[PDB]
Amino acid sequence: CKGKGAKCSKLMYDCCTGSCRSGKC
C-alpha cells in the first residue's frame, strides 16, 4: 500500500492508512 501523501488508487484505495485523496493517499 502507500502512506499518506503517496500515490493513491481511485479504483483500489491502496492507501496504507486511508484512501485516495486528490491523487495522493
Give DSSP secondary structure letters for the chain.
Answer: -B-TTSB--TTT--BTTB--BTTB-
* Cell numbers at 12, concatenated: 483500489
Rounded to whole angstroms, the Cα distance separating 18 from 11 reads 13
Compute the radius of gyration of the chain from its Cα atoms: 7
Given CA atoms 11, 6, 4, 17 in this order, what sign does their dihedral have?
Answer: positive
Interruptions in the chain after residues (C–N over 2.5 Å): none
The length of the chain in residues reads 25
The set of long-range contacts for 2-8, using a CB threshold of 8 Å and a minimum separation of 24, is none
Count other C-beta atoms under 10 Å from residue 24's C-beta.
13
> Under a CB-based contact definition with an 8 Å cutoff, are residues 2 and 21 in contact?
no
